[PDB]
Amino acid sequence: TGDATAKYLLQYILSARGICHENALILALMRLETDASTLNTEWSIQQWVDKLNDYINAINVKLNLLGYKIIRINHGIGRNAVTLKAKQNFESFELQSIVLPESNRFFVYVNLASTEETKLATRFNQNEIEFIKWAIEQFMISGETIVEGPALDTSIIVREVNRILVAATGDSNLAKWRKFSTFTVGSTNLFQFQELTATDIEDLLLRLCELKWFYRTQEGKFGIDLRCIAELEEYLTSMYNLNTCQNCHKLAIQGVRCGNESCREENEETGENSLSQIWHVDCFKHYITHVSKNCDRCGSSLITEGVYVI
Template identity: 75%
Template sequence: MEAYQERVSTTATADATRYLLQYILSARGICHENNLILALMKLETDASKWSTEQWTDKLNDHINAINVKLNVLGYKIIRINHGIGRNAVTLKNKQNLSLFENNTTVRDHEDSTTDLQPMVLPESSRFFVYVNLASTEETRLASRFNQNEMEFVKWAIEQFMINGEIVIEGSASDTSVIVKEVSRILAEATGDSNLKKWVKFSSFTVGSTDLLQFQELTAMEIEELLLRLCELKWFYRTKKGKFGIDLRCIAELEEYLTSTYNLNTCQNCHKLALQGVRCGNEACRDEDDETGENCPPQIWHIDCFKHYITHVSKNCDRCDSLLVTDGVYVL
């Protein structure tokens, strides 16, 4: 009897792992952590007994099991955090998708239904992304786009990178999620809720009008391609109609982006940061050991900046500039 129950449990676990992979693939290869937890809650039979931490651990177990199977095929589910931070991502998902308070039902061991108590899932900026490890940047692009479209994607990325290095003197929009998060973090770290906002910002985004200047495609072809790139989570579009690089593109092309464009990675987690906070001291530059070129000033994701300024220092570790007053929003 025990052997039979063990086989049933093993089969159920394998089925849940397979269904989660199918769910990720059906979502174009990228899912927020709490989407997957909610999906997992529909699959597990003893759900009503588990804590939030157990759900998270169980999900990670399934992802690890998926990666064991995918490894021989040259694929992997990687974990990537969104640069705007867990608080902002949580609020966005709660408003748009109603993910965080769950009153779902699950089957118990007698195959009846048991109402779960409302459960608030943890704040999370983590996404799970299905990526191809075996191919190069060129073949990853070629698997999705024709030659002209590939050239447009590379050209558009170059425009994003060029624009992102330009620091603009002036006040960023108070409605920006980055501005709101930085203000909240600085107020908590200093105890002063009346700190003046920074007067510099930069953005790795480009307006649609500028992107229509690509010569090898018509305006209609570019508009259709931009829509497809957003659906694939390679690009994203802001409310003001600007485009930037989304998480899936970062996940698949991070090494290419950092090496090709001499980008500085997050001071805390050492991952590519295209949204967050940058040191406002233009003298905060360091020479790259390989290229000999000057790297941009120190940069942090929002959550990494919160950790740094709360637990490490309120001064930039490279140039000693006071980050509380001398920072740049990276929008």
């Protein structure tokens, strides 16, 4: 079944255009352990996620020998948020009332090096990927800029940040953080490309959103999603001078920051815009529940003087 199972799961993952939540792979495993009738009763979800990780390790040995890879990244909007969004769509078709730990790991299928062989693996023309790069530089440039105002109570970043603040402190008598900075440009500016037309950008953004990398927020704004990790993994951001996380040093463009005057002041000694320390929502949760309440760069206090990033 080793051939069979390790042959099924990769098909599952690269059929879905790449990205696929962990609680779907762990159910496909129960699908295929019954398709070859290898039933099990002495197991819990721990052995199951262990076996899934083992199979992914074997498949990754083979693929890394071939030149592709199955990364294992986290989506940074948090356990409760992602389990809500996923197992909220599993209420009509559901398996046998099994319990799943609210997980966040997102296996992704990407190529390591931009060789000449996989140079042409696209549906897009020249102008279309030119627009893609132009759009993503607009995404990061709009990300660097912070502005003042009232932050909405509609996005899930905001509700979750407030919930975990209240749960950690216990004292609910706290106000809103007074700024926001978005890595998600609005539509009307990306529509303003020079060479292409408007309807072209319309249907092109629709196509990209269908290719599982340009998720569109509830307000009608799109960012960049889990096929960012296939794109200049960290110099994608340090190129436009965006730093990384704190608790894990992986990427983060949405979560919690503290851009107050202390951890501020990007390095003008060299000119590179090395901005503030950025957390992930679960990263921020742990850093505030079991470490401190202070920005580590220049000793701030962020439970009152933090930033919303969206």
